[PDB]
Amino acid sequence: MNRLDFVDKPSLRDDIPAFNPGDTINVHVKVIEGAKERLQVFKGVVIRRQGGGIRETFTVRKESYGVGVERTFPVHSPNIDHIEVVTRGDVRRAKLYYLRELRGKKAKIKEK
């Protein structure tokens, strides 16, 4: 328990899956382009959780056109429509920062 758990409690969300660092995740992000409100898919490998409840973030890393991108959303953020797990991963660390220096075949995560 924490002292401020009666303030974070109405802002929490359900329907967020149980994904671990090492999984492969679609993130659907609401994007305003003028006044259009479309919905953009971000598919990548979750490398990080930094917990705390309402203050918890996760970090996905894709390789876009020969250039790697990382996004760091908050969990329980209302600009995320839904999260869908594509592939579970078999890792040994909790932060997976060693993928920031790998490309190609060597930046592969196993399939359990």
Binding site: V29, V31, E33, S64, Y65, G66, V67, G68, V69, E70, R71, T72, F73, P74, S77, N79, R100
Partner: protein, 122 residues
């Protein structure tokens, strides 16, 4: 974040491969350059036979940055390299097409032409 003497890979086909920052335009003694900030730069490396040559003073807008950017909703974007697009003085790219992804901070800095030529705006 980019300041004076930083080197940036070049994300279009003007002929330049590597430019070096000189100022960060936007005010007196402005120190850093995020996404959507205009750089006066010199051209340090080029492709042989291209349009621009070594030692030309250009303007350029930063489109990729290794340092994170706090977007106004709590999310961040981070790239593996520093990239820029050499631009005309009416905020249009000098080359014909843009390589690699760019940031969505270019939308509110009225860079509509770089968005339409980029492969993926994030």
């Amino acid at each position: 974040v980019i300041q004076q003497e930083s080197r940036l890979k070049v994300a279009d086909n003007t002929g330049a491969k590597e430019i070096l920052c000189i100022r960060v335009l936007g005010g007196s003694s402005r120190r850093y350059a995020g996404i959507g900030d205009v750089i006066v730069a010199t051209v340090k490396d080029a492709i042989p036979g291209g349009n621009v040559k070594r030692g030309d003073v250009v303007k350029a807008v930063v489109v990729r940055t290794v340092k994170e950017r706090r977007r106004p909703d709590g999310s961040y974007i981070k790239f593996d390299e520093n990239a820029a697009v050499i631009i005309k003085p009416d905020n249009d790219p000098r080359g014909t097409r843009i390589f690699g992804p760019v940031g969505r901070e270019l939308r509110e800095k009225r860079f509509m032409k770089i968005i339409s030529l980029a492969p993926e705006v994030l």
